[PDB]
Amino acid sequence: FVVPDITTRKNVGLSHDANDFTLPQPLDRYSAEDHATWATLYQRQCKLLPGRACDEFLEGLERLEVDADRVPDFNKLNEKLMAATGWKIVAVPGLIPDDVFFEHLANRRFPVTWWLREPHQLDYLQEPDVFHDLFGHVPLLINPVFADYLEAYGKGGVKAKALGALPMLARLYWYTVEFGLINTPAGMRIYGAGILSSKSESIYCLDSASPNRVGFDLMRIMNTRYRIDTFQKTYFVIDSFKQLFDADFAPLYLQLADAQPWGAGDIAPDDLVL
Numbered sequence: 486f487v488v489p490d491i492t493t494r495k496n497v498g499l500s501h502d503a504n505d506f507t508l509p510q511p512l513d514r515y516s517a518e519d520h521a522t523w524a525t526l527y528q529r530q531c532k533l534l535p536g537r538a539c540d541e542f543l544e545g546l547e548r549l550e551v552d553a554d555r556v557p558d559f560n561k562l563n564e565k566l567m568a569a570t571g572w573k574i575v576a577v578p579g580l581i582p583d584d585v586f587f588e589h590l591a592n593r594r595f596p597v598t599w600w601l602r603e604p605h606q607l608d609y610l611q612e613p614d615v616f617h618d619l620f621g622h623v624p625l626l627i628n629p630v631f632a633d634y635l636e637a638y639g640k641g642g643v644k645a646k647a648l649g650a651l652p653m654l655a656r657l658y659w660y661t662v663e664f665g666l667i668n669t670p671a672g673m674r675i676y677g678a679g680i681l682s683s684k685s686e687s688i689y690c691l692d693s694a695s696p697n698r699v700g701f702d703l704m705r706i707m708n709t710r711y712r713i714d715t716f717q718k719t720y721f722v723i724d725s726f727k728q729l730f731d732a733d734f735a736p737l738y739l740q741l742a743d744a745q746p747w748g749a750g751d752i753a754p755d756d757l758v759l
């Protein structure tokens with residue numbers, strides 16, 4: 486007998502596709518309380534991100550008109566997202582298998598957990614919810630180079646076979662799409678979704694002496710461990726989304742397969758550090 490997780494409780498009486506894990510967005514299951522939780526999260530993040538989020542993120546939020554006051558209707562959002570970027574969101578019950586995830590990204594589908602966090606649980610979150618996925622991840626698709634990066638990432642994941650590739654690709658996604666920073670002429674800014682949807686990470690990642698801030702390096706990153714239950718110990722910094730995009734992985738998985746991974750707090754001899 487155990488504490489059910491929120492994914493299980495939210496999805497009772499609900500089905501999902503056996504192959505691709507999608508379902509129609511269950512609009513009737515958001516409460517008044519949920520729409521208030523959404524508005525509170527949205528308003529809080531939008532006061533923190535001036536000076537912090539990269540310009541492209543802020544542009545996406547505006548161009549997509551992500552709702553400020555209610556959990557968005559995914560079909561309505563998709564009208565704008567498809568026209569502007571060629572991508573669509575699909576509702577998923579929560580975390581889905583890695584192979585299923587890659588197949589969606591490879592086909593310009595972004596999986597979004599449909600349910601929302603409960604009020605006393607507005608942060609420290611580990612599992613995605615609809616605020617993290619829709620507010621954190623989706624707006625950055627307005628940058629076509631980042632969108633193409635995500636599609637390419639997915640196609641690479643579909644193709645990956647070598648033992649050890651899945652952790653390597655998870656680390657790459659984590660230190661870019663979830664927790665990446667970008668150097669800009671106006672100063673260091675944020676692009677990672679796990680930062681942008683979090684009050685605490687948004688502040689910490691640009692205002693703390695403890696973590697390392699390391700220039701992006703693909704092979705380094707694929708061989709670096711990460712932690713889920715704490716603030717990050719290293720952030721990787723890109724100079725441009727083109728650098729990310731410009732980054733066949735098959736020989737790379739083999740080069741790194743027997744390698745000892747770097748710890749989440751380590752500095753490697755070839756790193757460039759801030």
Ligand SMILES: C[C@H](O)[C@H](O)C1=Nc2c(nc(N)[nH]c2=O)NC1
Pocket residue numbers: 577579580581582583586596597598613654655658
């Ligand atoms: C990307 C890496 O494989 C990571 O373990 C995954 N992230 C996600 C996932 N599933 C969902 N719904 N969202 C994610 O962000 N499964 C796979």
Ligand SMILES: [Cl-]
Pocket residue numbers: 644645646647650734735738
């Ligand atoms: Cl491979």
Ligand SMILES: [Fe+3]
Pocket residue numbers: 613617618622663678679
């Ligand atoms: Fe995420």
